[PDB]
Amino acid sequence: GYMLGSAMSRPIIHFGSDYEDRYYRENMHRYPNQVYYRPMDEYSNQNNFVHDCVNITIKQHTVNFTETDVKMMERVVEQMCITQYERESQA
Ligand SMILES: [Cl-]
């Protein structure tokens, strides 16, 4: 029973690796702009929410993708899952 959030903008994250900084700029459109999540009411801890959200969002979006893609999406979808938590908090 994982819901799917509405579209949001993909963040722009900068990486220490010059390769990865640039890889992200070019490929960022290949990554989710929505996130899967179990509902905020089933968690006391945002860390568990985000962790779940990242795991499911990245599975659903691969169930095409490099190892580098998965580092990218780990940092970037976390940040989107945090945004989504913010969305549910406000509500
Ligand atoms: Cl996480």
φ/ψ of 86, rounded to 5, equals -50, -50
Residue that is written with structure tokens 């700029």 in the block? 25
Ligand 1: distance of its center to the CA of 47 in Å?
7
Q: How far is CA 66 from CA 7, 30, 56, 72, 76, in A?
A: 24, 12, 18, 10, 15
Ligand 1: distance of its center to the CA of 72 in Å?
13
Q: How was this structure determined?
A: X-ray
Q: What is the structure's resolution, reported in angstroms to one decimal? A: 2.3
Q: E strands, the chain, where?
A: 3-4, 36-37
Ligand 1: distance of its center to the CA of 26 in Å?
24
